[PDB]
Amino acid sequence: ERIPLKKMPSVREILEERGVDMTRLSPVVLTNYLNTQYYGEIGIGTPPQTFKVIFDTGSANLWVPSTKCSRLYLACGIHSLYESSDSSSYMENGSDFTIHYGSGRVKGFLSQDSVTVGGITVTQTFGEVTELPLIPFMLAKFDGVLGMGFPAQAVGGVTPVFDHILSQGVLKEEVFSVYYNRGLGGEVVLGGSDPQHYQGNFHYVSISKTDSWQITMKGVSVGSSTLLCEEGCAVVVDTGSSFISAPTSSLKLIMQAYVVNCSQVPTLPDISFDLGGRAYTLSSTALHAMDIPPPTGPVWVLGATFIRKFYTEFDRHNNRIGFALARAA
């Protein structure tokens, strides 16, 4: 059940610790892994080769770096690498695959092997990567990504790891939840929600998009005066991102009540989100702007800053996302 997430210095923090100015730079790739601060561990093959990977609801693909990456792409060779020759359960596919990480592309080739997560082993097709772009993977500690999205938003319709876990019928519920710690680490839970890391009762919102973790938000109120999204804004609850995102035009109106107007005062107004008629509020605590074109545009993103306060259950059977007040012990 329990997969313990570990704390990580993001590529942003790695760059900001050095001291630097502003610099340059199929399904929709939502998250930039520049700001990601969390990873979990998974085992591939027989015997298991361990990999540090991001648990990302934004994507539906599982990829790790291969031993077969070229000398021309140096970002791949740094991380832990998958060798097919050390696995008895390896079964070759050979088909090309290409995820568009940002402007640049993450290229490789497909392959099948036994993938172990949270004690459960499943036969999974994954893309062993041969070309990672320079930004932002060279500085990043995490090896690859584990997609928690739907089969439709995967590449080549490859069934995700959670879908294979549902096929076995091992879990009590067909769900997974996420908890990020207030401070060292996190937690992904499979087949339920952990009562230690929540308080009160869950309340659920139905999924609006056909096959994604997207829900329609009905109000973004600053303090006690409403600004945006009364008619309806689409919102993705991403696990692999830390920041909260919004449309570029919408972000300006919220910032009013390169440039960020942050000064040391704790009496700034609380900001809340209306999800299924219930107000989900954040005291202080940052934002960003992502303008995606339609379809899947314009859209917001609720990252780890939201999920830190609210423990989030991702329900696949009922197609819904539940929220509840978080806590530690």
Ligand SMILES: *[C@@H]1O[C@H](CO)[C@@H](O)[C@H](O)[C@H]1NC(C)=O
């Ligand atoms: C690779 O696996 C996929 C299943 O996701 C399948 O559709 C495809 O035919 C396989 N390709 C080869 C060359 O075996």
